[PDB]
Coordinates of C-alpha atoms in Angstrom, one line a residue:
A1 CA 0.0 0.0 0.0
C2 CA 1.4 3.5 -1.2
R3 CA -1.7 5.6 -2.4
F4 CA -4.6 3.1 -3.2
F5 CA -3.3 -0.5 -4.3
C6 CA 0.5 0.1 -5.2

């Protein structure tokens, strides 16, 4: 996880 799914 980074912003949504990554």
